């Protein structure tokens, strides 16, 4: 399938993943695309922050779903 990831900065990332890919695999693909360690990615889907160890089906993530890649600010 194909999911989308929108960022605080307003950038969209198209990802080609399967239904049962672990959250870790999606984080590593986002890394390959942009280069952010998984331990620093904050992925949110339907009011839930994707934790490692789970899968996309565990969060009921379907085709053309839209995740949010966010981060914390300190200013």
């Amino acid at each position: 399938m194909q999911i989308f990831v929108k960022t605080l900065t307003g950038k969209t990332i198209t990802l080609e993943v399967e239904s049962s890919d672990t959250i870790d695999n999606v984080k590593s693909k986002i890394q390959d695309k942009e280069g952010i360690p998984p331990d620093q990615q904050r992925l949110i889907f339907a009011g839930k922050q994707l934790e490692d160890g789970r899968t996309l089906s565990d969060y009921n993530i379907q085709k053309e779903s839209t995740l949010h890649l966010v981060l914390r600010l300190r200013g």
Binding site: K6, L8, T9, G10, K11, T12, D32, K33, E34, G35, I36, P37, D39, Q40, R42, I44, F45, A46, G47, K48, Q49, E51, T66, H68, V70, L71, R72, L73, R74, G75
Partner: protein, 954 residues
Amino acid sequence: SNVLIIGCKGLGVEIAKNVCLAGVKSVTLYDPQPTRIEDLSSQYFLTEDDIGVPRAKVTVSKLAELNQYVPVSVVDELSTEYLKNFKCVVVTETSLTKQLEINDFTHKNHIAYIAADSRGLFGSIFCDFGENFICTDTDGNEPLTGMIASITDDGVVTMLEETRHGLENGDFVKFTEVKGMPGLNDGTPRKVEVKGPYTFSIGSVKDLGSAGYNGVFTQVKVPTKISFKSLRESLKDPEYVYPDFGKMMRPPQYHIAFQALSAFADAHEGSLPRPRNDIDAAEFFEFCKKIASTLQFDVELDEKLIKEISYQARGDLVAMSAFLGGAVAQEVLKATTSKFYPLKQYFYFDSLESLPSSVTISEETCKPRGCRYDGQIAVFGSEFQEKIASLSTFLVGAGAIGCEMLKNWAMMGVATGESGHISVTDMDSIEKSNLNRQFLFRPRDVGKLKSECASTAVSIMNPSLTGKITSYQERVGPESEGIFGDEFFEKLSLVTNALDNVEARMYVDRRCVFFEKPLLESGTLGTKGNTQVVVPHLTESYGSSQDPPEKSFPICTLKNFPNRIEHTIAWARDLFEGLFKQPIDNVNMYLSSPNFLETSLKTSSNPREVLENIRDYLVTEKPLSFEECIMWARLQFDKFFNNNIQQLLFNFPKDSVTSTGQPFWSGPKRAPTPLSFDIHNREHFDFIVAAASLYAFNYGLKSETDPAIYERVLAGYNPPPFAPDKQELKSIADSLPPPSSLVGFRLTPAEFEKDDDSNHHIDFITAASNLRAMNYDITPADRFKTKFVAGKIVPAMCTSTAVVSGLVCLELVKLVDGKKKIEEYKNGFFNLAIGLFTFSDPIASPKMKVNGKEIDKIWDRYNLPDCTLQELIDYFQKEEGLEVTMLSSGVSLLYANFQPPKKLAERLPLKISELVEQITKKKLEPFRKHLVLEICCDDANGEDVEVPFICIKL
């Protein structure tokens, strides 16, 4: 950029505050409705002694006092053709019919229109900038740029080695210094087609050359026509903007309910449904059904959710007001500046999880009592109100975020009860700043402690807090653990950060984790912001995660004790403005407006500086040759790197203390040392050159870069030595020359520009920054690095601050309710530049099995006495079946099972306190009650079993 704001309740006044602090041409109010006690639930410019008077009349005095460059007036009537005198119109507390009329008119005459309403825990926003609105910046992000390896003849640009371009399909880019293709560097943008994270096509450019090499590409921001539909033709099929994809089915419910609310109002003499009333809720739900059948809205109406808007129809919460007010103010900024992508077009938001469950929320509890908290009680209930009153908060920091948080706590009545109390702390002091307006801090408040001044203003807002706010002036860190110790926390209810650095956040997080106290955390970055909550034994802490490396640097307000070079860069920019801009504009408008003094007597909040600027820049210190500009620059050096620091040290000697007795001088970076000018030192010489060039540019005189002239003039000029208001102003003003001497003399004001390298701007910035760095022992930077770091400074915006404050308070009402389920808390993230919001359940704290028992890796711990190391080992072996392999305190390794027995026989029979004293070579201060030890152990199989930490009591 003229703005009109209809409605001056909590939401409207918040919008006006943020619009004034942000800065626009003018601001106009309209709200003749008499003031009501309940209005004081979220409106902080209304006093209990202002009941019965129109609201705008009494808030205009306090809104104009915010920004002096933004005049605020009031209008008592409102015509239709009058709305043409405004670039944007904002509407709150207005029926849907008058809204429709006004929006029809504006949209027909191409006039921005923004409607907003705050109803309990529900909020609605609508925008309409006409069918031909132009937006010059769609995301606000700084243009991208990259090093090009090569460019094929078909347009395949490739990146240098493995550099990412980060472009999206549709972006336009221009090129510079491209070998092989000359015609590509002119500047004509070309559409981008991404084909990978390191390559992208731009189309056949083989007419410009057979190939290109070693270039530099830079993104171009293209305008965009956004076509908005009038509120009328968009009411059937509105376009939503979802704040929480987890609540995807709620925006339509709210779109119908906010109309049914106006209908119910029209049908009952303007009255709104009573708080938590059932028959009113039934009438409201039937109005919803009617409006849904008329608009042909094919949606199943949620009865409970909808009636929850009738129940909370009279709710006026300060948190919702702050949130939506920051949002709508940023939308007004979008409308005026044509920058950032606005909401298109409907925005329906709720914080329903904030509703309490530990108390009874019926009609008898939420009933109006006749006080300021009415608008709040209607949502939470008298009972809950007391829980708010009996609060013990620790606010860390009294900056913009801290001031917003205090205003919210005050409107909410936090700590007003018998046992309630507030504890604020922030070492910084209020210092002038010609480019930074603040909410509570006034120019007259300069020289005071932020915490105390904020406490005073808050008390003015809600006098019920007087004597309830202990305002400390301490830095929060390891040294301040004598004041903020065990006794200080055992009384607290919750802690709230209003910080600007990550180290303070981490320290406060560790402290809160130790004392098992909830924490609220907020941060900003230009138009972006985030909000996080930490709940004991529930969520993981702020330190349990790491963030990416900061790509930019945020500045809220100049710091009194700089530590990094960015602080001195910002300071040097503020100095640039104060020296080569504001005085010159004062002189210019003095010789251009005939009644400059007559009006400055009122408008300006510091007429002394205006008069002194006019004096020194027009006559007293008027340069007639470049050498006189060099003398001026010498004097400015003495003023800003010698005399000021001497006076500072005279006011705060190296051994002074604070209100509690701690050392006034922080620790990280000690007190500054003044500078003695010496032209042979090149920083001093570069400052002299840049300042002289700018001062000569101001008066049109020719600048020189030959050191010979500088040496000539400075060989015979030494400024004077240095050692540490009613009639004076008028005498100085009368000591001016007649403005009738207008000879068209224009003083060219310095418009800051960084991309140019022949204007001596970055020169001045670098010189002043490095001199101030030298003052405070900071690593200086060079021309290139200074330019780069200056390009990456972002000033915090009041809007994001208000938004984070609102969200933090919405989480605070959860914290006081005692909610123990993680699904009900919400960490928030937002970027206002693109109208993006997101919320996510916090991450639960990781639980672990030890001896077959679940324990929290972050909150649970072992509490032991000050025993001997052998006693502790034996305890963990016999009471826990654990072979302790490592025991450490702080960053010091105490015991390890592999160390030689000689080294151990001298440490096994010692008490843990004595062990720490011997290992650290530093005795324990007397006020330490507890010690924290990390340990690593192995079970009976020799396998490392992770375990909590130890709290040794002594």
